[PDB]
Design a protein around this ligand. Sequence first.
Ligand SMILES: [Cu+2]
Ligand SMILES: [Cu+2]
Ligand SMILES: [Cu+2]
Ligand SMILES: [Cu+2]
Lengths: 104, 103, 103, 103
Amino acid sequence: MATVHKVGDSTGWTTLVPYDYAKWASSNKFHVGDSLLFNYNNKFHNVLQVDQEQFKSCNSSSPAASYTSGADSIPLKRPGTFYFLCGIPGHCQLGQKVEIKVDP
Amino acid sequence: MATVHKVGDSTGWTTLVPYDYAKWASSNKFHVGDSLLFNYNNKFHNVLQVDQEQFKSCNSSSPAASYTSGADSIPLKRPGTFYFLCGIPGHCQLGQKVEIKVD
Amino acid sequence: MATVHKVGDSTGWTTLVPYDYAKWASSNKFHVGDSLLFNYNNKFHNVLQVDQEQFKSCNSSSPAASYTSGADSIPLKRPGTFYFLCGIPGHCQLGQKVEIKVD
Amino acid sequence: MATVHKVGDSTGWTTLVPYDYAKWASSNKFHVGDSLLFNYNNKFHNVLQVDQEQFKSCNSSSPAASYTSGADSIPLKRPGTFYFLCGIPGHCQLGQKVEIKVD
Ligand SMILES: [Cu+2]
Ligand SMILES: [Cu+2]
Ligand SMILES: [Cu+2]
Ligand SMILES: [Cu+2]
């Protein structure tokens, strides 16, 4: 059964305090058909889908997709690794980025 | 016990022509385990899940969830009533909203 | 085959001077598969697709589609009447709107 | 006996993964009467027809035509070379551009 994964659990998608999104991802199992739910104050953050190179360098200049609702539901349709980060200046560097492994 | 319901059938989720989404919902039977499929031009529409109050007043300010893929597959995993509307300015008022009764 | 119709011909999509877009449309024959090309300075205009009611009242508050490139190519894929207007305040009232009858 | 060429085949027009559009173009033959089909998520990409100069420098400021349907069917009724690129910031630089030689 498809499952909705709330990014950061009760903490959500934020930069208010440090939060290890890599550990959040590791504590979850993502399957095709699942979705990610990003909850945040859209006056301070957004969600951008990028590739591995942009993810590692925190490059938010050329996103493959962008979400700005504050309650974005993003589908995980195929097996592989997906990368998301907040594009607001300096946020990715603060650790607001997450790698999602779908059905490895 | 496992059916995919195409919202608006072949017409999809749109405002180009008047479409009775209420009649579409009433012409279908939704059961837990089923899913909804919203097909639309995602540059011009979106799908927001909201509560009863927001649904009636067409308020798209604080949605519970926002879908923007243009082919959203939304699973119905619990009995009850669910509300969806398009948050693009004025689309909800034109009738692009739908109430789903599950189980 | 298909044909590209340049809206307003050499005059384009503008409000600089009065231009009868209805006459332009009547002098053209639109077929399924054809496209419309709107050329304009996008700092002053845009192109919105609306329904008949909104078209008649120059209501640009809830468009079905929006284009803002200044060189928009819009496909005409089905038989029927389509309506377009510029949504910048007062432009539709100046006559910057056009009804397209496809086949 | 016209032929519809689906740009990027099943992969379509995207930047999600590196895709060699140049190889795609080279592995296909385009003749007058054919058409190109660009399939993509139109909220995140577009198709702009530009000149050789703009193509090389990935300049999308003054396109000859802008397509945004997500399933653009573009007829090729003249021999020669045509240039297309995605105007979304940085996409052209990532390689989302294609040169088409007809006849
Ligand atoms: Cu942020
Ligand atoms: Cu809508
Ligand atoms: Cu105007
Ligand atoms: Cu693009």
